[PDB]
Design a protein around this ligand. Structure first.
Ligand code: 819
Length: 208
């Protein structure tokens, strides 16, 4: 069973802006996703301080980057606190409505697209490089679900089975045809060092 939803108008407009604005500095998408992963990891870390059983679904707190040139995908995987089905539908746990409003106002005051993460909506910068995004997540309090959107005003949510993760979130970027540089090892290393050099969790770049 697949459920199809319409984005809130403000979010559809944010995504359209990201997709259609001329802006060459696309590489900042990765730091925004790594930042979200770090936040999710902080959350499960702090929770586990008073309830160790929260880590029964996995003790290791880390981030993996997985390029695949055959599929033309870049996948960011973390073992953070994950998201419930409800939070997936509610704009994947972000304050998208109020965040988008503040972001647009900032763009009128001299801000540019690279400031997007300051307003809680950095996830949508994924559409600078991806034609489709799949978000697979598992929270301790719910089952495993897959969110997906190629923009155009809608997203889908379904249950996900076949490769269960213990806990956390996996963001699969289906890259646009002209953005395959982000599958190259030296390019990914360069971007991590430039924008995500000091993060409180290990980042592992998989080899092909
Ligand atoms: C509510 C304040 O934060 C936001 O509005 N947005 C940033 C944010 C949202 C959800 C998460 N998150 C949680 S909680 N659990 N998993 C995630 C998570 C979400 C994403 C995007 C799909 C939004 C991600 O790339 C990685 C994550 O671990 C982390 C940061």
């Amino acid at each position: 069973e697949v459920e199809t939803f319409a984005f809130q108008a403000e979010i559809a407009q944010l995504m359209s802006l990201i997709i259609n604005t001329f802006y060459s500095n696309k590489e900042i998408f990765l730091r925004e996703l790594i930042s979200n992963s770090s936040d999710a990891l902080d959350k499960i870390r702090y929770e586990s301080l008073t309830d160790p059983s929260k880590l029964d679904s996995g003790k290791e707190l880390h981030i993996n980057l997985i390029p695949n040139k055959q599929d033309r995908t870049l996948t960011i995987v973390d073992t953070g606190i994950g998201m419930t089905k409800a939070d997936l539908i509610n704009n994947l746990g972000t304050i998208a409505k109020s965040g988008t409003k503040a972001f647009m106002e900032a763009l009128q005051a001299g801000a540019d697209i690279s400031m997007i993460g300051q307003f809680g909506v950095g996830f949508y910068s994924a559409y600078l490089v991806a034609e489709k995004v799949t978000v697979i997540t598992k929270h301790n309090d719910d089952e495993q679900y897959a969110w997906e959107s190629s923009a155009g005003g809608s997203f889908t949510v379904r249950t996900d089975t076949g490769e269960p993760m213990g806990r956390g979130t996996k963001v699969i970027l289906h890259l646009k045809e002209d953005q395959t540089e982000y599958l190259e090892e030296r390019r990914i290393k360069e971007i991590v060092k430039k924008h995500s050099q000091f993060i409180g969790y290990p980042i592992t770049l998989f080899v092909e």
